[PDB]
Structures are given as C-alpha cells and as structure tokens.
Design a protein around this ligand. Structure first.
Ligand code: FES
Ligand code: ZN
Lengths: 86, 77, 54, 52, 194, 295, 119, 168
C-alpha cells in the first residue's frame, strides 16, 4: 500500500502537461461558478486549431462500485459514517 | 360493533327511548329552513353536474379536440 | 341568489373573459319540485322482512 | 390460476333461496300486533312510542 | 467555583493572550480525541459533559474551558464549527462536542444569521408570479349584492318569521303531552354580559 | 399625447442594462455550498470563445432587472354581513382556494369574522396563506427580524446590501409596503456612503437609478461614474433624467445648446444638480487626465 | 375493495396527536374507515387558533365541485364549513343554534340585572 | 471492471439519453441488419447502442431483430391501424436513423412537456400526508400553528385531563 501509493501519486499527469501533450486549453467547470469556464492551464507551444473528435460513446472500462453507487444500489451500513476530523 | 348473530343484552330488554319534546314554533320554522336550504342546494348540485358533462363532452367531441386530431393525422400523412 | 362566494367567482370569470354585465347570477329553483316528507313512496321497489320468526 | 370449484356454496345458495320462496311468512304473521304489549310476536320488537 | 469574567462580553476571550497561548491559530477542537472501542466510533457523542455540577473525565472542547461561551455575538467561536467552504455546521462526532453544546451551537449559529452577524449564502431566487396585475375580483372590489345594500340577509329564511296560529295548533295536536313552551321571536342582536 | 417612459421600456432598459455592466467574476462568484468535483474539458481557442459567449447569455438572464411596481392598494371589500352569527364564535376562519391551476393573484381568500362578516383577506393575510399551502423556498410565514432597522444597519456596515435585497425579494412581493421601504433604505444608505459599485453587475442597479432619477439624487452616482472613467454611463444618466423630466432647466438648456456627450453633464451640473461645484471639479480632473493619455 | 351498496362522501378525516386535532378534508367511500383509504384530499381544517388568532380552512373548490357533480354527499360538519365560507347557504341548524344561544343569553341577563337591581 | 465491451450502455444514465418516444400507433418494430458489409455498418451500431435506449423508453413496443435475411438492412414499424412503415437505413449512420425515426414516428418536445406537467398536478403542496406522497404530514410543522404535543407540551387548559377534573 505504501509502495503502490507513491507509485500512483508520482505518475499522475498535471493540467499543464495535458495541455502541452494535446496543445489545447484545460478548462475547469464548476457548479458553484455555473457555466463560467476557468482556464487552469494553457500550452506554451502552438495551440491546436482543430478540436478533439467528439466520441458518441467512450470505450472506457468502468467500475461497478461507482456505477452501483450513482444508481442508488450500494447498500452498506458502514459507508458515509460520522467520524472525527481527519 | 355487534353482528346480526349476536344476542341482545339483558339490560336493554326493557328500554323505551321516549322522543324529545317539540316546540311548535321552532319546529315549524326549522322545517321550512330545511325545505329552502335543500332546494337551494339541489340547484347548485345540478349546476356542478352540468359542468362535468360539458368537460367530458368537450374533450372527446369538442371543437378544440377534433381540430387537433386532424392536425395530428394530417402531419402523419 | 347564489351564495356569496360563488357569486363572487361568477362575476370574476365574466370580467376575466372581458364580458361586462350588471346582471345578477341567479339559480333556477323552478325545476326543483320540493315534495313533502309524507309523500307516498314506491312500495314496488321496497323490501320485505325475512323469514326468521322469533 | 384455476380456481378450485366450490359446489356446496352454490347448492346451499339455491336451497336457501328456494326455502325463502316456499316458507315465506305472510302478511298475517309479519304484521300481527299484540295490543296489550304492543309488540310484533313474529320478531318481538316494540313499536315506536308515537305509534302506540 | 469557575466564574468566567467574559460572561457578558464573550468575544474578548478569543482576542486575548490566554486563548492564543492555549489554542493559537487552530480551532479549540483541534487537539481533542474521543476514547472508544474500535476504529469506528459511535454515531452520537455523549449527551453532556457536566452532570450535577460535575465534569467527566474527558470534557469536550466547549466544556473543558469555562471561558468559552456559546453566544450568538461570539461569531469568532461559531465560525470554527461551520465549514468555510460549504457553510455546513459539522456534526458532533466531527468536533467532539456533546449533544447539549452542539444543540446550543446550532441555535446560536442560526440566531447569528438572523441578526446579520454571520455571513451565509443567500441565493437569488425567481419571482413567485409570472403576472402582477391586481384587477381580478379576488383582490379587487366586488359589486355589492342588493341584499347587502338594503341591510337584509342573503336569504329571507335566515330571519325568524312568526308562524301562523293554525299551524302551531297542528303540532300541538300532533305531539300531545310531549311539548315544550313556545318560543318567541329571538332578539335582533346577541346580548352581552355587562 | 406625451407619455413618460416607464421602467420596462426598451429605450430605458437598454440604458440601465449598459450602466449595470457585465462582470463574470462577480456575477458567477463561487457560491459557498455543497461542492462536487469539477469537470475538465480540452477546449481550443474557438471553443473557449463560444463557452464564454454562453456565459454572457446566461449572465444577462441572471441580471434581468425586476419590474418596479407601486404600492398596492389595501383590500377592503365585504362580501356578506350575517348578523345572526354574531357571538357564536370567538375566533375567525380563513378559507383559501387551494386549486393548483390558478394564479395566486386570482385566488379567493375570504375571512368569516366573529361578527358574521364575510370579507376578503388582506394582502398581509393573502401572502401568509399562500406560503402555508404553496411554500416557496426562501420565504417565511413570519416576517424575519433581520428587516428591522437595527439588524439592517448591521448588514449595511458589512457592505452586504445585495444580500438585503435578495432576502426581501424572497420574502416580500414587489408591490408590498415592506419591499419598497427595505429597498429605499438600502439605496439611501448607498448614496450616503457612496457604495454604488456593490450593486453594479446585478439586477438591483436599474432599480436604484430609477429611484434617484425620480427623486433627483443622481449627483452621487454621476460623480462615482466620472471617477471610474465611465463618461458613457454618466451621459446616458443625464439623458435619461431629461426624458423623465422634460420641463426642467437642464433639458431646456441642452436643446438650446444642443449639448452632447460631456457637455450634457456641464449643463446639468449648473442648472439643476445640487452639487454643481463638486461635479465640475470632478469632471475637470478627469478631462485633464484623458488629455495626457492621448498624447 | 368492493362494498355492497354505498356511495362517496366529502367528510373530515381526523388526524394529529392527543389534544391536537387536525382534520383533512377528503372524498372517501361511505363504508371506508374515517382515516382509512380516500379517493382524494380536498383540503384541511385546523380547529386550534394560531398565533394570529385564526382557524385555517383549505378548500379545493375546483375539485369539490367535481365530486359533488359525480354523486358525492356532504357531511354536516363539511356542510357548515361551506356556509361559513359562502360556497353553500348557512346550514339551518347554524341559524337555529344561534337563536337558542341568544334566548339563553337573554334569559341570563335578567337574573344578573335582578340581582344587581333587587340586591 | 464492468464486463463486456462498452459497459457504459448498461447504465441508467445512458438508457435515459434516448429522445425517441414513439406514439401510441407504433406497436411492433422490426430491425433487419446484416452482420457484414460496409453499407450495413450504421445498422450494426444502431443495434449496439440505440436499440437499448428505444426499448427503455418504449417498453410496451415489441422490438424484434433478424440477421442476414435480406441483402440490405431496413427498419419496419407496424402501426395499430394496420399501416407498415418501411425505413431503408442503408448507407446511413446510427445518428441519422435515430433522428429519422424521431421525426416521422417520434414525439416532439412540446408534446412531452405537457405529459410531465400533468404529473405535477398529482402532487399538491397543500395536501398533508406521508413523505412518500405529500410534503408535510400534519399542520403542526407550519410555523404559527399549535405544535405537536410530543415536542411542545400544550397548556393544562387545552388538555382533556384537567378539563374533566376542573369541571368535576
Ligand atoms: S404530528 Fe401534527 S400533532 Fe403530532
Ligand atoms: Zn460537553
């Protein structure tokens, strides 16, 4: 758990790299700020003039634990329990 | 409450409910108020009954209901 | 007459639809024939005591 | 979903209806009145006090 | 006996040097931990830390210091029990306060928001009505009925009308021996007890 | 003949919309509420312009100035008087027609008093009854205590004038007696303390300009606009003032001199403005600074 | 459920805790329980006076006129709430009980006067 | 992870993204598609993505599929009047088929709002009852009205215990 946590926390891609890798703007959308688009990172190099091809459905492997929670099916008497400040 | 097959009580065998005393004036006056009240409420009931027929007949054979079935059928063709 | 509130709601539809009139709403109580309480009813639609002698 | 027939409830129903039509009480029995106790011997029910 | 001197002005204790030397810049509940079995604690904290003028072993942040007064004017202490990012009052197990003080904090926090002392998110709602005309009879004037202008009842039968003698005679005959004294016309207005 | 523009006229709304301005950072300020993790989208230069263009369309729908109405007239209408029911009851009944498909201003709410009088419910009673059967988020049956003079001042001291107006809009109706008094107090304090900027880029700015122009108290607002390099807004305010008051000294003077732009402020400053001297000094300084930038 | 005979009635369904009565106007079958199954809820009545001193009576006039035109009866308490509102005429017994109360109070003023007069 | 390719299809969010609500006429829907060939590619993607969305919105409409029965793919709807609607979907993408059947046999946005507004009149805010059906259970939850005795004890003058003792 310790050797795996540092491995995943060091191999995470930032918003600046994502922009540089794809030469596009990384925009942050927040419900509290409504539809306003917040630019968190922009590429230092040539900004691409063509948008990413939109995909009707994405072939991304999902997690049943997350899908089961969003559909209101994960019954557990131990989740979201009142605990102390951490 | 009791049923039809339950025997009657033995304390009520010899019970006679005497009707209340009648005041000639109030009773006569009270018999006319009911006479008029019920005639005024029967007319309103008929009115309320007449509005339920219209609405029912204004939805299946109405002018605004037969004018939309042709619009929906004309757009289908 | 109509009772006070109903009369007030019948005069507000008129003015909402735009109809302007000074006539009173009135109920036709000529149809309702109020018969006495001691008027002979129908004995040919009335029931009979069951055969349970006591 | 095939209801098991109940024949005794139909046999009795016909018999009870038939008896009500052959043993029916007459007007002389139903509407007799004892004029001293003011009760209907058939049912033993007192009349109302305003009719006495 | 503990007689806190900031009872009347509780906000002066948080801006003193005794508070900074004990708590500093962190909240009063930063260094509090509950004692329980397991890793998962009970969903409710103890009802109260003071029973008949006796404090328990491990008092909560509000009960261990007698100079901390839960009042609606002490906004600096009530901000430590409200999230600064979501504006939600934390539940008891979070801070460790007892039900009695957490029930007193919520009441003090809702009273500081009703007095304009505590800042809270106020949304921009929409109008209740799409129209604003006040010409309808429901909120306007209705043509007075004739009976109302003549000082008469809506219906005639409302008023008492004396019945004829011949008809009362029928009733008397109809109900012999089971009668009550005839009633005269009632007074026009209800009497009052002087 | 000659009708004076109202608050909802296209010519006036366009002027008050421009004065209000549009600031996305202030219009879509991060609300303090339950939060969710944000979503990220890889956008191009053109996709970012269209996303910001949709925010300007939603901010103009969120800045829609609420209509300004006049104090509603009390409801004193008796439907029936039944003297036979006098003394038979101690408390009064309040009947409400809870039919769904009916506007709340066409709903019948009557009161049968202990004297047998069947009257119509008053405005204060109507609004209360509609919140009991048709509750609206933000509104309370019992008038809150924040709208008291002492509590309101506390809020004014924290520069929370936009919060007082939002609470009033969610508790009282535009044509109430409490919605007009609570608004005017907020506007009056703004003029005294010169806090006009707070209501800028909101839906309560147009209503604040409509109260000063009609009560002739635009000297403070005009000065603030001049001190923020906003001559365009400053000149449209005098033009608006003229329109509402055609038979005024400034309006007549303008036509005579055909004053335009900055000239209007000068003509108005002398003839009508209460603070004529201060406006000229403030306007003077601005003009001098502008010349340096042009050089 | 099917009942032999019966009909619909606009009555009051008692609710609330002990010493806190709250009625909720409903259209329900005659043979159904007072607070049992109902076809529709047409309003509410709060007998206890509120802080302002008034009794709240919610009436769904639109739906009350529909069920009255479908064959629904009215209970005496519900027929007296519509007379107070002005939807129906004052129930005869509301007028007769008011006359009895007057005679009663006029009979007690004599005794009170005599006492102060005679004594 | 979630088994199968494109597991997002087996989600309530994706099944409710369909905007094709058939009318009352549409009773039976038949899909004839070819497993192989370039021309039939759209129909294969229509059966892989969109068919679940249509059956979720139209659960009482029969949807039957037939493989390699004809040289070209096509859709055919059977109305309740006896009319058959042929829809040649060859040389077409799945998005075109979904937008084509929504125009000839699907409902618009005006007809759908009306249906939803009819369900808002079934839940009256004034009505009192259980949380499942109504917002409030009693009128003791309304500020101003007499509170429930459980939370606030009523005065001794409003209780029938003392009234009886007081009377006698
Ligand atoms: S729930 Fe309303 S009184 Fe107990
Ligand atoms: Zn404690």
């Amino acid at each position: 758990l310790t050797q795996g946590l540092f491995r995943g926390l060091s191999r995470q891609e930032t918003h600046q790299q994502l922009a540089d890798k794809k030469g596009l703007h990384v925009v942050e959308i927040r419900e509290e700020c409504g539809p306003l688009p917040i630019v968190v990172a922009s590429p230092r190099g040539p900004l691409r003039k063509d948008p990413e091809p939109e995909d009707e459905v994405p072939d991304v492997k999902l997690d049943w634990e997350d899908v089961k929670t969003a559909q209101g099916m994960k019954r557990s008497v131990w989740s979201n329990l009142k605990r102390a400040a951490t | 409450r009791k049923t039809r097959h339950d025997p009657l009580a033995k304390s009520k065998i010899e019970r006679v409910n005497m009707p209340p005393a009648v005041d000639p004036a109030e009773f006569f006056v009270l018999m006319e108020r009911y006479q008029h009240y019920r005639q005024t409420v029967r007319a309103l009931r008929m009115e309320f009954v007449s509005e339920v027929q219209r609405k029912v007949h204004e939805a299946r054979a109405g002018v605004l209901a037969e004018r939309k079935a042709l619009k929906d059928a004309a757009e289908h063709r | 007459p109509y009772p006070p509130l109903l009369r007030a709601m019948i005069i507000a539809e008129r003015q909402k639809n735009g109809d302007t009139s000074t006539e009173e709403p009135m109920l036709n109580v000529q149809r309702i024939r109020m018969e006495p309480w001691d008027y002979p009813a129908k004995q040919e639609d009335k029931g009979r005591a069951k055969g349970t002698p006591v | 979903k095939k209801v098991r027939p109940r024949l005794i409830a139909e046999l009795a129903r016909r018999v009870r209806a038939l008896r009500e039509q052959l043993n029916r009480p007459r007007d002389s029995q139903l509407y007799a009145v004892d004029y001293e106790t003011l009760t209907r011997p058939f049912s033993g029910r007192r009349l109302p006090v305003r009719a006495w | 006996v503990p007689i806190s001197p900031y009872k009347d002005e509780p906000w002066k204790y948080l801006e003193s040097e005794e508070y900074q030397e004990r708590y500093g810049s962190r909240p009063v509940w930063a260094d509090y931990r509950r004692n329980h079995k397991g890793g998962v604690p009970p969903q409710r904290t103890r009802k109260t830390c003071i029973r008949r003028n006796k404090v328990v072993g491990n008092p909560c942040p509000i009960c261990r210091d007698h100079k901390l007064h839960v009042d609606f004017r002490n906004v600096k202490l009530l901000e430590q029990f409200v999230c600064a990012h979501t504006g939600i009052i934390f539940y008891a197990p979070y801070t460790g306060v007892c039900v009695k003080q957490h029930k007193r904090l919520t009441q003090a926090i809702q009273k500081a928001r009703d007095h304009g002392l505590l800042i809270y998110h106020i949304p921009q709602v929409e109008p209740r009505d799409l129209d604003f005309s006040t010409s309808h009879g429901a909120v306007s004037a209705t043509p007075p009925a004739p009976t109302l202008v003549s000082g008469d009842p809506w219906y005639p039968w409302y008023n008492w009308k004396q019945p004829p003698e011949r008809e009362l005679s029928r009733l008397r005959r109809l109900y012999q021996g089971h009668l009550q004294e005839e009633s005269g016309p009632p007074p026009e207005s209800m009497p009052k007890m002087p | 003949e000659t009708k004076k523009p109202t608050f909802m006229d296209e010519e006036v709304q366009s002027i008050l919309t421009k004065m209000t301005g549009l600031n996305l950072q202030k219009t879509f300020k991060p609300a303090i509420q339950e939060l969710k993790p944000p979503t990220y989208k890889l956008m191009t230069q053109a996709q970012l312009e269209e996303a910001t263009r949709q925010a300007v369309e939603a901010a103009k729908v969120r800045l829609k100035m609420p209509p300004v109405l006049e104090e509603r007239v009390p409801i004193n209408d008796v439907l029936a008087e039944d003297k036979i029911l006098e003394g038979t009851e101690t408390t009064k009944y309040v009947f409400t027609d809870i039919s769904y498909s009916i506007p709340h201003r066409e709903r019948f709410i009557v009161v049968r008093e202990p004297s047998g009088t069947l009257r119509k419910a008053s405005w204060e009673e109507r609004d209360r009854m509609i919140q009991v059967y048709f509750p609206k988020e933000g509104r309370k049956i019992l008038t809150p205590i924040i709208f008291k003079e002492e509590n309101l001042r506390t809020m004014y001291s924290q520069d929370r004038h936009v919060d007082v107006l939002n609470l009033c809009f969610a508790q009282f109706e535009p044509d109430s007696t409490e919605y007009i008094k609570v608004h005017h107090k907020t506007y009056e304090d703004i003029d005294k303390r010169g806090k006009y900027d707070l209501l800028r880029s909101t839906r309560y700015f147009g209503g604040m300009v409509w109260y000063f122009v009609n009560n002739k108290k635009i000297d403070g607002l005009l000065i603030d606009q001049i001190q923020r390099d906003l001559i365009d807004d400053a000149t449209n305010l005098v033009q608006l003032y003229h329109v509402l008051h055609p038979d005024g000294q400034s309006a007549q003077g303008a036509k005579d001199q055909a004053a335009e732009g900055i000239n209007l402020i000068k003509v108005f400053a002398k003839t009508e403005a209460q603070k004529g001297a201060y406006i000229e000094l403030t306007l003077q300084t601005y003009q001098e600074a502008l010349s340096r930038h042009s050089a | 459920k099917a009942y032999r005979g019966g009909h619909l009635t606009i009555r009051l369904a008692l609710g609330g805790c002990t010493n806190r009565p709250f009625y909720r106007i409903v259209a329900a079958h005659n043979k159904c329980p007072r607070d049992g199954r109902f076809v529709e809820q047409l309003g509410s009545y709060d007998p206890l006076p509120n802080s302002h001193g008034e009794k709240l009576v919610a009436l769904n006039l639109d739906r009350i006129r529909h069920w009255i035109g479908c064959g629904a009866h009215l209970s005496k308490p519900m027929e007296k709430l519509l007379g107070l509102a002005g939807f129906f005429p004052l129930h005869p017994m509301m007028i007769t009980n008011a006359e009895r109360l007057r005679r009663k109070r006029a009979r007690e003023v004599l005794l009170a006067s005599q006492k102060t007069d005679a004594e | 992870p979630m088994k199968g390719r494109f597991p997002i299809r087996r989600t309530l969010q994706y099944l409710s993204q369909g905007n094709v609500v058939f009318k009352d006429s549409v009773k039976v829907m038949t899909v004839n598609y070819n497993t192989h060939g370039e021309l039939g590619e759209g129909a294969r993607k229509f059966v892989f993505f969109n068919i679940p969305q249509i059956q979720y919105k139209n659960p009482w409409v029969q949807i039957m599929m037939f493989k390699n029965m004809t040289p070209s793919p096509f859709l055919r709807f059977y109305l309740d009047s006896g009319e058959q609607v042929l829809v040649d979907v060859e040389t077409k993408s799945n998005k075109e088929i979904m937008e084509h059947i929504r125009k000839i046999l699907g409902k618009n946005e005006e007809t759908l709002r009306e249906e939803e507004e009819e369900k808002k009149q079934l839940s009256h805010p004034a009505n009192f009852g259980p949380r499942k059906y109504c917002l409030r259970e009693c009128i003791c939850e309304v500020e101003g009205q007499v509170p429930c005795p459980s939370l606030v004890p009523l005065p001794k003058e409003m209780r029938g215990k003392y009234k009886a003792a007081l009377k006698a």
